[PDB]
Amino acid sequence: MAHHHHHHMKKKDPLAPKRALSAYMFYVKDKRLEIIKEKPELAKDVAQVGKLIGEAWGQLSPAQKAPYEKKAQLDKVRYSKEIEEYRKKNQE
Numbered sequence: 001m002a003h004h005h006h007h008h009m010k011k012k013d014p015l016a017p018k019r020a021l022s023a024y025m026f027y028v029k030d031k032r033l034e035i036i037k038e039k040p041e042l043a044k045d046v047a048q049v050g051k052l053i054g055e056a057w058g059q060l061s062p063a064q065k066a067p068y069e070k071k072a073q074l075d076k077v078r079y080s081k082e083i084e085e086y087r088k089k090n091q092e
Contacts, residue, residue, distance in 0.1 A: 017086050022075030023068050028053060 002008070021029075031053055036043040060068075 015090065016083060019079055019082065022072050022079060024072035024076065027068060031056065 032049050035049055035052065042048050057065075
C-alpha cells in the first residue's frame, strides 16, 4: 500500500475515540477555508491567514467571543482529558 496517490502520513485519527471539532478549530478552519475558496491566491500565505485570525480575535466582540471561548475551552478541556486517558490506556 505504497502508491504516489496515497502517501504515508497522519490523514486522520482512526485510533481515537468519538468526538467533534471544537469552536476554536471551527473558526480557524472556517476563516481559512473561506479565504481560500474566495481567495485561493493567498491560500499559500500562512502568515496572512494567521494575522487575520489573531487580529479578528483580538478585535472580536464579547458577543461571539463569549460562546466561542466558553465552547472552545469546555471542548478543549473535555477533549484533552478524554483523549488523554484513552491514549494512556489505549493499544492495550
